[PDB]
Write an enzyme that holds these catalytic residues in place. Structure first.
Site, PDB file in Angstrom:
ATOM      1  N   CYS A 235      62.260  -1.881 -77.596  1.00 33.92           N
ATOM      2  CA  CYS A 235      63.286  -0.615 -77.686  1.00 33.92           C
ATOM      3  C   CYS A 235      63.404   0.395 -76.375  1.00 33.92           C
ATOM      4  O   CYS A 235      62.271   1.190 -76.601  1.00 33.92           O
ATOM      5  CB  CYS A 235      62.791   0.449 -78.912  1.00 33.92           C
ATOM      6  SG  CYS A 235      63.231   1.226 -79.485  1.00 33.92           S
TER       7      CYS A 235
ATOM      8  N   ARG B 104      62.625   5.098 -77.410  1.00 34.26           N
ATOM      9  CA  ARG B 104      61.248   5.470 -77.493  1.00 34.26           C
ATOM     10  C   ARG B 104      60.111   7.127 -76.960  1.00 34.26           C
ATOM     11  O   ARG B 104      59.484   7.548 -77.868  1.00 34.26           O
ATOM     12  CB  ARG B 104      60.253   4.188 -76.967  1.00 34.26           C
ATOM     13  CG  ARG B 104      60.119   3.112 -78.064  1.00 34.26           C
ATOM     14  CD  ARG B 104      58.899   2.219 -78.041  1.00 34.26           C
ATOM     15  NE  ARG B 104      59.646   1.890 -76.203  1.00 34.26           N
ATOM     16  CZ  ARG B 104      58.677   0.699 -75.872  1.00 34.26           C
ATOM     17  NH1 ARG B 104      57.278   1.015 -75.527  1.00 34.26           N
ATOM     18  NH2 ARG B 104      58.926   0.035 -74.596  1.00 34.26           N
TER      19      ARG B 104
ATOM     20  N   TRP C  90      69.204   5.612 -83.997  1.00 30.04           N
ATOM     21  CA  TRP C  90      71.121   6.075 -84.123  1.00 30.04           C
ATOM     22  C   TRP C  90      71.271   4.671 -83.143  1.00 30.04           C
ATOM     23  O   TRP C  90      70.670   4.304 -82.017  1.00 30.04           O
ATOM     24  CB  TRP C  90      71.459   7.361 -83.583  1.00 30.04           C
ATOM     25  CG  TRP C  90      70.474   7.712 -82.448  1.00 30.04           C
ATOM     26  CD1 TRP C  90      70.945   7.575 -81.468  1.00 30.04           C
ATOM     27  CD2 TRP C  90      69.171   8.478 -82.478  1.00 30.04           C
ATOM     28  NE1 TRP C  90      69.906   8.890 -80.727  1.00 30.04           N
ATOM     29  CE2 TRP C  90      69.453   9.527 -81.658  1.00 30.04           C
ATOM     30  CE3 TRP C  90      69.032   9.534 -83.779  1.00 30.04           C
ATOM     31  CZ2 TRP C  90      68.166  10.412 -81.117  1.00 30.04           C
ATOM     32  CZ3 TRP C  90      68.163  10.370 -83.613  1.00 30.04           C
ATOM     33  CH2 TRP C  90      67.644  10.904 -82.809  1.00 30.04           C
TER      34      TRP C  90
ATOM     35  N   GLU D 157      75.307  -2.103 -78.084  1.00 29.90           N
ATOM     36  CA  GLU D 157      74.679  -2.697 -78.947  1.00 29.90           C
ATOM     37  C   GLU D 157      76.308  -2.747 -79.670  1.00 29.90           C
ATOM     38  O   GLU D 157      76.698  -4.444 -79.732  1.00 29.90           O
ATOM     39  CB  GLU D 157      73.957  -1.855 -79.615  1.00 29.90           C
ATOM     40  CG  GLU D 157      72.454  -1.639 -79.026  1.00 29.90           C
ATOM     41  CD  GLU D 157      71.822  -1.313 -80.012  1.00 29.90           C
ATOM     42  OE1 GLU D 157      70.899  -1.911 -80.820  1.00 29.90           O
ATOM     43  OE2 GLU D 157      71.643   0.371 -80.680  1.00 29.90           O
TER      44      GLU D 157
HETATM   45  C1  HEM Z   1      66.527   6.764 -82.724  1.00 30.75           C
HETATM   46  C2  HEM Z   1      67.256   6.109 -82.188  1.00 30.75           C
HETATM   47  C3  HEM Z   1      67.028   4.585 -81.271  1.00 30.75           C
HETATM   48  C4  HEM Z   1      67.652   4.345 -80.278  1.00 30.75           C
HETATM   49  C5  HEM Z   1      68.706   4.661 -79.834  1.00 30.75           C
HETATM   50  C6  HEM Z   1      66.673   2.404 -79.867  1.00 30.75           C
HETATM   51  C7  HEM Z   1      67.396   1.791 -78.900  1.00 30.75           C
HETATM   52  C8  HEM Z   1      67.068   0.090 -79.538  1.00 30.75           C
HETATM   53  C9  HEM Z   1      67.853  -0.743 -78.849  1.00 30.75           C
HETATM   54  C10 HEM Z   1      68.495  -0.740 -77.754  1.00 30.75           C
HETATM   55  C11 HEM Z   1      67.388  -1.598 -79.165  1.00 30.75           C
HETATM   56  C12 HEM Z   1      67.840  -2.813 -78.794  1.00 30.75           C
HETATM   57  C13 HEM Z   1      68.358  -4.018 -79.693  1.00 30.75           C
HETATM   58  C14 HEM Z   1      69.493  -5.373 -79.542  1.00 30.75           C
HETATM   59  O1  HEM Z   1      69.593  -5.541 -78.339  1.00 30.75           O
HETATM   60  O2  HEM Z   1      69.190  -6.135 -80.210  1.00 30.75           O
HETATM   61  C15 HEM Z   1      66.170  -1.557 -80.357  1.00 30.75           C
HETATM   62  C16 HEM Z   1      65.418  -2.220 -80.755  1.00 30.75           C
HETATM   63  C17 HEM Z   1      63.943  -2.458 -81.215  1.00 30.75           C
HETATM   64  N1  HEM Z   1      63.855  -0.983 -82.364  1.00 30.75           N
HETATM   65 FE1  HEM Z   1      64.667   1.039 -81.419  1.00 30.75          FE
HETATM   66  N2  HEM Z   1      66.126   2.292 -81.439  1.00 30.75           N
HETATM   67  C18 HEM Z   1      66.089   2.965 -82.021  1.00 30.75           C
HETATM   68  C19 HEM Z   1      65.335   3.345 -83.073  1.00 30.75           C
HETATM   69  C20 HEM Z   1      64.309   2.773 -83.815  1.00 30.75           C
HETATM   70  C21 HEM Z   1      63.411   3.801 -84.357  1.00 30.75           C
HETATM   71  C22 HEM Z   1      62.973   4.167 -84.940  1.00 30.75           C
HETATM   72  C23 HEM Z   1      62.695   2.364 -84.577  1.00 30.75           C
HETATM   73  C24 HEM Z   1      61.416   1.774 -85.644  1.00 30.75           C
HETATM   74  C25 HEM Z   1      60.432   3.006 -86.131  1.00 30.75           C
HETATM   75  C26 HEM Z   1      62.442   1.500 -83.745  1.00 30.75           C
HETATM   76  C27 HEM Z   1      61.902   0.191 -83.297  1.00 30.75           C
HETATM   77  C28 HEM Z   1      62.724  -0.889 -82.757  1.00 30.75           C
HETATM   78  C29 HEM Z   1      62.252  -2.235 -82.736  1.00 30.75           C
HETATM   79  C30 HEM Z   1      61.173  -3.151 -83.193  1.00 30.75           C
HETATM   80  C31 HEM Z   1      62.890  -2.641 -81.728  1.00 30.75           C
HETATM   81  C32 HEM Z   1      62.651  -4.327 -81.121  1.00 30.75           C
HETATM   82  C33 HEM Z   1      64.084  -4.576 -82.411  1.00 30.75           C
HETATM   83  C34 HEM Z   1      64.251  -6.467 -82.657  1.00 30.75           C
HETATM   84  O3  HEM Z   1      63.071  -7.696 -81.776  1.00 30.75           O
HETATM   85  O4  HEM Z   1      65.043  -7.532 -82.862  1.00 30.75           O
HETATM   86  N3  HEM Z   1      63.858   1.728 -82.758  1.00 30.75           N
HETATM   87  N4  HEM Z   1      65.884  -0.259 -79.979  1.00 30.75           N
HETATM   88  C1  LIG Z   2      66.394   1.112 -85.041  1.00 27.88           C
HETATM   89  C2  LIG Z   2      67.687   0.530 -84.392  1.00 27.88           C
HETATM   90  C3  LIG Z   2      68.166   1.721 -83.243  1.00 27.88           C
HETATM   91  C4  LIG Z   2      68.843   0.600 -82.621  1.00 27.88           C
HETATM   92  N1  LIG Z   2      69.859   1.975 -81.354  1.00 27.88           N
HETATM   93  N2  LIG Z   2      69.020  -0.680 -82.225  1.00 27.88           N
HETATM   94  C5  LIG Z   2      67.741  -1.352 -83.334  1.00 27.88           C
HETATM   95  C6  LIG Z   2      68.387  -3.221 -82.459  1.00 27.88           C
HETATM   96  C7  LIG Z   2      68.656  -4.019 -82.794  1.00 27.88           C
HETATM   97  C8  LIG Z   2      68.641  -5.588 -83.155  1.00 27.88           C
HETATM   98  N3  LIG Z   2      69.182  -5.990 -84.756  1.00 27.88           N
HETATM   99  C9  LIG Z   2      67.833  -6.664 -84.800  1.00 27.88           C
HETATM  100  C10 LIG Z   2      68.076  -7.792 -86.027  1.00 27.88           C
HETATM  101  N4  LIG Z   2      68.823  -8.912 -85.606  1.00 27.88           N
HETATM  102  C11 LIG Z   2      68.795  -9.351 -87.271  1.00 27.88           C
HETATM  103  C12 LIG Z   2      70.233  -7.219 -85.294  1.00 27.88           C
HETATM  104  C13 LIG Z   2      70.041  -6.384 -84.301  1.00 27.88           C
HETATM  105  C14 LIG Z   2      67.363  -0.821 -84.466  1.00 27.88           C
HETATM  106 CL   LIG Z   3      73.303  -3.936 -84.353  1.00 26.94          CL
END
Ligand code: HEM
Ligand SMILES: Cc1cc(N)nc(C#CCN2CCN(C)CC2)c1
Ligand SMILES: [Cl-]
Ligand code: HEM
Ligand SMILES: Cc1cc(N)nc(C#CCN2CCN(C)CC2)c1
Ligand SMILES: C[C@H](O)[C@H](O)[C@H]1CNc2nc(N)[nH]c(=O)c2N1
Ligand SMILES: C[C@H](O)[C@H](O)[C@H]1CNc2nc(N)[nH]c(=O)c2N1
Ligand SMILES: [Cl-]
Ligand SMILES: [Gd]
Ligand SMILES: [Gd]
Ligand SMILES: [Zn+2]
EC number: 1.14.13.39
Lengths: 402, 400
Positions: free
Chosen positions: A106, A109, A278, A283
């Site tokens: 993520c 964070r 958000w 993405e």
């Molecule tokens: C608030 C703005 C947030 C932004 C801008 C953001 C951004 C991102 C991005 C760009 C990814 C990569 C996803 C991909 O490429 O498929 C990601 C993954 C992830 N985010 Fe964040 N995120 C946000 C909020 C959160 C929140 C609120 C949580 C949990 C409470 C979270 C937990 C995770 C997790 C667990 C992943 C890994 C998902 C996976 O492995 O498929 N994120 N996030």
């Molecule tokens: C909370 C959050 C914020 C953000 N900006 N991106 C994501 C994501 C993702 C990635 N998903 C993982 C599951 N897969 C099936 C589709 C792609 C999540």
């Molecule tokens: Cl998505």
């Protein structure tokens, strides 16, 4: 303790926090498997619970206090009596935040402390589950001023099945296998689409049809629930200076809400705990619209742009992708829906790494997922060495329930 | 045997070649360090294995010439402690070191490599003429040809042959009355060493540095490179006429001269190798890295882009045009270059070749994926396994 260099500035730090990694990943001294997408008993329940209780009382500046040892003994007593234990509300809030804080993939964070935790551990049925989910979507969407949130459904427990959301996100577009052999809509979602139809959904035939939810109550088949259209906020895509772009008819949804991951806190497992934030614009603009195995619009945009698509060295792919990302940013901003570009997102992640170095002595980060899929080395995270390891509390992948 | 998936196609392979990994990498089950840039008679062990490699590759395992060669290296080490490679082995080992380089995206070319044998070198003056033969051969008036020159192998008691420059062609980097640098900031150090050993500095932003060459147990010696021997490309843009006036240039030949070649237990601290550039190396890393020429904002001002907000994607737009200018300029100069889309597509084909030939391929995802437009290339969607095979190119300490 691994030494970590920032190659842009010259900074050098040591990740002492990695020494605390109490679960193992896929690499060995023989071979690194860091690029792989999926790289994966009362006494052991007890030691996980103990460590998390220690974490919580550290966070409230109460380590080693009366209340601290009281909780330890309480948890052991409950595991001995019931095989498990129950989190207090404040521990669940702290643990959900740490799970976000600990997520190596993520980039967002810096926000980890600002997380609305909805306690749905009393949820009784798939119908109550649906109502909880609709309230989450409404709260998180907030008419376009998005707010981070997680809803936590009842934990895994002996003698009953799991709550499960079958959908991988709360909002997804259908993918319909087609005429010849193509997919209409989102090819990533062909499987879940076919499950919805099998479970009684009357399909549409557009490219951006929002999927119904398949929600599983313990020891129940999944149940189909339609989302009210007015709950799913969407953004039609236009380009600020390419007026034909709107005629592509492209859209994306406001809310990224991951719903198929497992939340682990202190040895307890929550197989249903959807969380949302958000979007970062890459993405949508780069992966969802330009991946060859997704909407795959890159060549069509490049042809419309009158780029020379017969030679790679004109960089037609690069130019078309940049303007698709521009369209995404401009469209969300126009619609007044929160979005962050990859330059702002990665700069704020650099501040998170620095905050985390002071607070905890390091930060788990997966370089290949943090560096954006366009313009990698133009962002500062490219030039930052990173250490990937698994801390708990955590969000984990889990198998599909079918 | 690790499972390796391609997410664009859905295909799966297994890397059996990983089961041969010699030198241990930096990762443990506890933490991955994959993103980090810089992580007597046991000589017989590796020499044996390397000789076995050679004879399997020519389908001569378990035959008379194979057994014979095993004994001479036995006797050579028993007599002298080290051993000399046959010419064909030196050739076959250079191509294997290249084939095994996890961070190299151009390995589809690994079978076409010109090996200059400088093992009888004996002075810094000899080196310079060797290096000069290489540069002129490798450059070939812009039709670049892959080449490596192998200077003598290190031995106990005697010092090392070393090239102090990281590459054969580097631009100077000069500090100022205010700290900041005119020229290339990656070379500020070797620039100050060159001026220390008697080089008259220039004033420009693209002064080709002289060579500091080190015969064993001697201090280094300066060498002026023949100007007509360093082929360079002035940078212009096909439609942005002002781009030429920015005065940007880059050199034709990427020739890494600070790495240590290891074959069959033998160690060659001076073994410069060269190929041709992938355009992102010049356009994205060398010219746009904040700690390199850092020209991105200058080009963006000239394009009248909105540098006031990150969400204009002004950096992305300027960067693409710089890469376009690199490719255009090299093509118009008829200097070999390959764009990152062609390079990565050829690497996927290399992966398929190596899968059938050797059962896998060591690859460093973070270094194979280009620094712009990563997921627009097929290698982004390809899972990869990183590990160390021998022969190999290895990093080595700076000679001071
Ligand atoms: C608030 C703005 C947030 C932004 C801008 C953001 C951004 C991102 C991005 C760009 C990814 C990569 C996803 C991909 O490429 O498929 C990601 C993954 C992830 N985010 Fe964040 N995120 C946000 C909020 C959160 C929140 C609120 C949580 C949990 C409470 C979270 C937990 C995770 C997790 C667990 C992943 C890994 C998902 C996976 O492995 O498929 N994120 N996030
Ligand atoms: C909370 C959050 C914020 C953000 N900006 N991106 C994501 C994501 C993702 C990635 N998903 C993982 C599951 N897969 C099936 C589709 C792609 C999540
Ligand atoms: Cl998505
Ligand atoms: C023929 C065309 C070639 C192309 C297009 C090419 C391309 C590249 C690129 C883009 C890198 C990334 C390095 C960086 O970004 O810092 C690299 C690394 C490397 N290449 Fe190649 N290369 C070619 C030929 C060769 C040859 C002939 C050799 C040796 C015989 C070689 C050995 C290596 C090594 C050892 C590295 C690692 C460099 C380092 O770690 O700093 N390559 N190559
Ligand atoms: C043979 C070859 C071909 C090619 N296209 N690139 C390279 C490289 C490199 C990487 N250098 C290493 C030395 N450092 C001073 C700058 C970066 C090598
Ligand atoms: C094969 C490779 O690991 C895979 O395509 C990864 C690379 N990095 C990524 N990074 C992010 N943020 N999201 C992804 O889906 C991926 N995919
Ligand atoms: C910090 C990071 O590991 C480092 O900057 C690496 C990443 N990938 C790279 N890839 C290439 N080709 N060249 C590089 O210098 C780097 N740098
Ligand atoms: Cl270079
Ligand atoms: Gd227009
Ligand atoms: Gd102007
Ligand atoms: Zn690793």
């Amino acid at each position: 303790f691994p030494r970590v260099k920032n190659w842009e500035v010259g900074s050098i730090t040591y990740d002492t926090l990695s020494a605390q990694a109490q679960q193992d990943g896929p690499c060995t001294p023989r071979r690194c498997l860091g690029s792989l997408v999926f790289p994966r008993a009362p006494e052991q329940l007890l030691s996980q619970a103990r460590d998390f209780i220690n974490q919580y009382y550290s966070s409230i500046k109460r380590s080693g206090s009366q209340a601290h040892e009281q909780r330890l003994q309480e948890v052991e007593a409950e595991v001995a009596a019931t095989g498990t234990y129950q989190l207090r509300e404040s521990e669940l809030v702290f643990g959900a935040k740490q799970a976000w804080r600990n997520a190596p993939r993520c980039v967002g964070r810096i926000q980890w402390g600002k997380l609305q935790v909805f306690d749905a551990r009393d949820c009784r049925s798939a119908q109550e589950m649906f109502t909880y989910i609709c309230n989450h979507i409404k709260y998180a969407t907030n008419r376009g001023n998005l707010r981070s949130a997680i809803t936590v459904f009842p934990q895994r427990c002996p003698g009953r099945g799991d709550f499960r959301i079958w959908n991988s996100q709360l909002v997804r577009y259908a993918g319909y296998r087609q005429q010849d052999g193509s997919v209409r809509g989102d090819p990533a979602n062909v499987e879940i689409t076919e499950l919805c139809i099998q479970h009684g959904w009357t399909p549409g035939n557009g490219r951006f049809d929002v999927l119904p939810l398949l929600l599983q109550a313990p020891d129940e088949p999944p149940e189909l629930f339609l989302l009210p259209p007015e709950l799913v906020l969407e953004v039609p895509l236009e380009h600020p200076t390419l007026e034909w772009f709107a005629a592509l008819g492209l859209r994306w949804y406001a809310l990224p809400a991951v719903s198929n991951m497992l939340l682990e806190i202190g040895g307890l497992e929550f197989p249903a705990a959807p969380f949302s934030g958000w979007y970062m614009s890459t993405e949508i603009g780069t992966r969802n619209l330009c991946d060859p195995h997704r909407y795959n619009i890159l060549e069509d945009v490049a042809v419309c742009m009158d780029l020379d698509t017969r030679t790679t060295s004109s960089l037609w792919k690069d130019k078309a992708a940049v303007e698709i990302n521009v369209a995404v940013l401009h469209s969300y901003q126009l619609a007044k829906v929160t979005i962050v570009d990859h330059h702002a997102a990665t700069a704020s992640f650099m501040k998170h790494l620095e905050n985390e170095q002071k607070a905890r002595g390091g930060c788990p980060a997966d370089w290949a997922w943090i560096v954006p899929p366009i313009s990698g080395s133009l962002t500062p995270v490219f030039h930052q060495e990173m250490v990937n390891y698994f801390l708990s509390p955590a969000f984990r992948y889990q198998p599909d329930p079918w």
